């Protein structure tokens, strides 16, 4: 339940390890998906199956009014759940997580597009 | 009308967590940013469509 | 005119719910994008004529002045694999 | 200690269509509900498996070994007991012994000076019991390098009657000095042939041996002549490099396969 | 600050109104974990030495 | 129509949700 560099039996990778509900056959050591990428592993000492999640990543995108108008900016961590951002105002979206933008209940017309129905603007 | 927006971090595709490979890939110049400009240009035009 | 229209709408409803292939032009676009993403990830298993396709297993066997030459192969072959995908995506995106 | 077993009538080589047997898990990687394509040394579907009998009949010629091998035995009472693998088979070079006996499975690698008709022999008097008597396989064993023995067990040498009941299947491959065994056991209720049906061999063991192998031989259960080898039937198939598509289910077991060149 | 990241990335002292991609975020690994089978076949140097 | 990965690959959501496309 933390991001770590793992090395089980030379199968080096980096991700979040967590308990799997998969059961391997007694002899199988690694688990792969349709992409032929390792997504599960059985620990070689305490024989149990661990799911590997690729630990979180995404584009930073900066939302701004024009330079002349203002300097203030809001930041989008695309595809990131912001339980992971402070490690480096807040509002989670399906597009990723905004910081510095204020969330409002009123539906204005879309000025700067963000994603998943969300847009941003500069306002009082 | 549209297709799935996709995006790549070129460094995680080519060089996933190797700083050596990351410092070697840097020799090739703008090639990864040119790929991201292309894919983000496909991504925005899905909304335009 | 109403009874003909109300029947024709009923035939659309049944047809879409009955046959597999009617959504073909959309399912094809989902399948081409899945196939291209799958192909792009599979290219990471390819050696490109280097000693290995696993970047850490190159670094764990050769010293730096020649481990760089193997890593340069994988960089070249993977960069060629992204360029093939992005060219396919651009040409497709022009179709869409 | 050996004496030749020349008491055998000449018969021609029997053959059969190996239906879809001899598939094995090609790497130790779990796959769930997916179709996986691989290239490895496999027994082709519908290919001519060679077939042998012990009965009056005792079929232990030296066999080629090349690009790996498949072995199977429709059995009762465990007459098939092991195999011998190497390239000179004469103590000039190291060679590999596999034996199962009335105490243990055992594996050894040595310059064995093997004998010309190697076998395991047994006490068979009118007292209704069977006991080991004759380890008649070799004389010398010099500069040995790999050895293993199982935890000690008891197995039934008892002459169980009727049709064949136990089917064992094995694959033996040498790659880059590693010697790989894969195997499957199943119950069967059938008269004589290799069964139409599908099953995959799980990996049994991998040994870091580092010897060439170009020829193999088989070890069977039996005043120096005149004896009965109990009825057992065994099969050999030779693997070729070929592409297969394997279906894995949600449990990660091979459930069906396709030989791309059939 | 993120404004300076965009100015630098766009190569301009003025950035127009919009949304601008920079610098991919990636969770760093906390520590490095190594796992191998239980150790068993200790070579018997005790009966040598 | 029957329809975040390891190697730097991601999918991004459309600016209009399938609710907003339904509403238009
Ligand atoms: C590897 O060694 C570990 C040593 O800790 C073994 O773990 C113990 O296993 C027993 C099995 O009955 C448990 O009762 C103990 O609780 C375990 N120890 C601890 C500290 O939890 C493990 O079984 C060994 N595995 C193999 C495959 O040898
Ligand atoms: C983002 O991650 C947080 C956890 O870091 C998620 O919060 C959990 O949500 C589940 C489902 O409602 C609850 O059972 C947990 O108790 C929550 N824990 C915490 C710490 O929040 C959150 O749901 C995630 N959001 C998205 C959109 O993925
Ligand atoms: C077993 O039979 C073989 C013959 O089939 C015997 O081996 C031959 O022995 C002579 C010397 O006595 C050699 O010149 C031949 O070249 C050998 N031939 C083979 C095929 O090896 C062997 O001596 C017999 N051994 C016993 C104990 O019966
Ligand atoms: C099965 O084969 C093995 C190897 O030849 C036999 O094991 C030896 O048995 C003797 C007598 O019990 C012991 O003194 C040795 O120390 C054993 N050696 C090894 C390497 O284990 C075993 O006895 C055989 N069983 C039968 C029924 O013949
Ligand atoms: C996958 O393996 C599991 C465990 O062997 C099988 O699940 C069992 O199925 C039987 C028959 O329905 C049930 O009575 C058991 O209660 C199940 N056990 C468990 C632990 O779930 C399952 O059938 C196998 N899948 C296939 C396709 O054979
Ligand atoms: C295109 C545009 O709006 N440019 C603005 C201008 O309107 C404004 O008067 C000036 C004041 O700082 O900054 C710049
Ligand atoms: C926005 O609406 C939610 C209910 O959907 C409510 O809980 C919240 O207080 C509202 N915010 C404001 C600023 O009125
Ligand atoms: C298998 O052997 C039989 C003879 O027993 C022969 O008729 C047949 O053509 C052979 N087929 C193949 C594929 O070897
Ligand atoms: C049965 O075994 C005993 C030794 O336990 C032996 O004396 C006897 O001769 C054996 N029976 C026969 C028929 O030889
Ligand atoms: C196996 O065969 C090759 C080719 O003849 C040879 O180079 C190698 O040394 C042999 N191995 C042994 C252990 O003799
Ligand atoms: C030798 O044995 C003693 C006790 O029997 C032990 O303390 C010591 O470490 C051993 N030395 C070696 C090299 O095994």
CSV table of N, CA, C and O in Angstrom, one decimal, chain E residues 1 4 6-8 10-11 13-14 18 20-22 27-28 32 37-39 42 45 49:
chain,number,residue,atom,x,y,z
E,1,UNK,N,7.3,28.7,-9.7
E,1,UNK,CA,5.9,28.4,-9.6
E,1,UNK,C,5.3,27.9,-10.9
E,1,UNK,O,6.0,28.0,-11.9
E,4,UNK,N,5.7,30.1,-13.9
E,4,UNK,CA,7.0,30.1,-14.5
E,4,UNK,C,7.3,28.8,-15.2
E,4,UNK,O,8.0,28.8,-16.3
E,6,UNK,N,5.1,27.1,-17.1
E,6,UNK,CA,4.5,27.4,-18.4
E,6,UNK,C,5.3,28.4,-19.2
E,6,UNK,O,5.6,28.1,-20.4
E,7,UNK,N,5.7,29.5,-18.7
E,7,UNK,CA,6.5,30.5,-19.4
E,7,UNK,C,7.8,29.9,-20.0
E,7,UNK,O,8.1,30.1,-21.2
E,8,UNK,N,8.5,29.1,-19.2
E,8,UNK,CA,9.7,28.4,-19.6
E,8,UNK,C,9.4,27.4,-20.6
E,8,UNK,O,10.0,27.3,-21.7
E,10,UNK,N,6.7,27.1,-22.8
E,10,UNK,CA,6.2,27.8,-24.0
E,10,UNK,C,7.3,28.7,-24.6
E,10,UNK,O,7.1,29.3,-25.7
E,11,UNK,N,8.4,28.9,-23.9
E,11,UNK,CA,9.5,29.9,-24.2
E,11,UNK,C,9.0,31.3,-24.4
E,11,UNK,O,9.2,31.9,-25.5
E,13,UNK,N,7.8,35.2,-22.1
E,13,UNK,CA,7.5,35.9,-20.9
E,13,UNK,C,6.0,36.2,-20.7
E,13,UNK,O,5.6,36.5,-19.6
E,14,UNK,N,5.2,36.1,-21.8
E,14,UNK,CA,3.8,36.2,-21.7
E,14,UNK,C,3.1,34.9,-22.2
E,14,UNK,O,3.5,34.3,-23.2
E,18,UNK,N,-5.5,30.0,-21.4
E,18,UNK,CA,-5.7,28.6,-21.8
E,18,UNK,C,-5.3,27.6,-20.7
E,18,UNK,O,-5.3,27.9,-19.5
E,20,UNK,N,-2.2,24.6,-20.3
E,20,UNK,CA,-0.9,24.3,-20.8
E,20,UNK,C,-0.2,23.1,-20.1
E,20,UNK,O,0.0,23.2,-18.9
E,21,UNK,N,0.1,22.0,-20.8
E,21,UNK,CA,0.8,20.9,-20.2
E,21,UNK,C,2.2,21.2,-19.9
E,21,UNK,O,2.9,21.8,-20.8
E,22,UNK,N,2.7,20.7,-18.8
E,22,UNK,CA,4.2,20.7,-18.4
E,22,UNK,C,4.5,19.5,-17.7
E,22,UNK,O,3.6,18.8,-17.1
E,27,UNK,N,4.5,9.7,-8.8
E,27,UNK,CA,4.8,9.3,-7.4
E,27,UNK,C,6.2,8.7,-7.3
E,27,UNK,O,6.4,7.7,-8.0
E,28,UNK,N,7.1,9.2,-6.5
E,28,UNK,CA,8.4,8.5,-6.3
E,28,UNK,C,8.2,7.3,-5.4
E,28,UNK,O,7.4,7.3,-4.5
E,32,UNK,N,13.2,0.6,-1.5
E,32,UNK,CA,13.5,-0.5,-2.4
E,32,UNK,C,13.4,-1.8,-1.6
E,32,UNK,O,14.3,-2.1,-0.7
E,37,UNK,N,13.6,-16.6,-2.3
E,37,UNK,CA,13.3,-17.7,-1.5
E,37,UNK,C,14.0,-17.8,-0.1
E,37,UNK,O,15.0,-17.2,0.0
E,38,UNK,N,13.4,-18.6,0.8
E,38,UNK,CA,14.1,-18.9,2.0
E,38,UNK,C,15.4,-19.6,1.7
E,38,UNK,O,15.5,-20.4,0.8
E,39,UNK,N,16.5,-19.1,2.4
E,39,UNK,CA,17.8,-19.7,2.3
E,39,UNK,C,17.9,-21.0,3.0
E,39,UNK,O,17.5,-21.2,4.1
E,42,UNK,N,22.9,-24.0,2.5
E,42,UNK,CA,24.2,-23.5,3.0
E,42,UNK,C,25.3,-24.5,2.7
E,42,UNK,O,25.2,-25.7,3.2
E,45,UNK,N,30.8,-25.6,4.6
E,45,UNK,CA,32.2,-25.2,5.0
E,45,UNK,C,32.6,-25.5,6.4
E,45,UNK,O,33.8,-25.7,6.7
E,49,UNK,N,36.4,-26.4,7.4
E,49,UNK,CA,37.2,-25.6,8.3
E,49,UNK,C,37.2,-26.2,9.7
E,49,UNK,O,38.3,-26.3,10.3
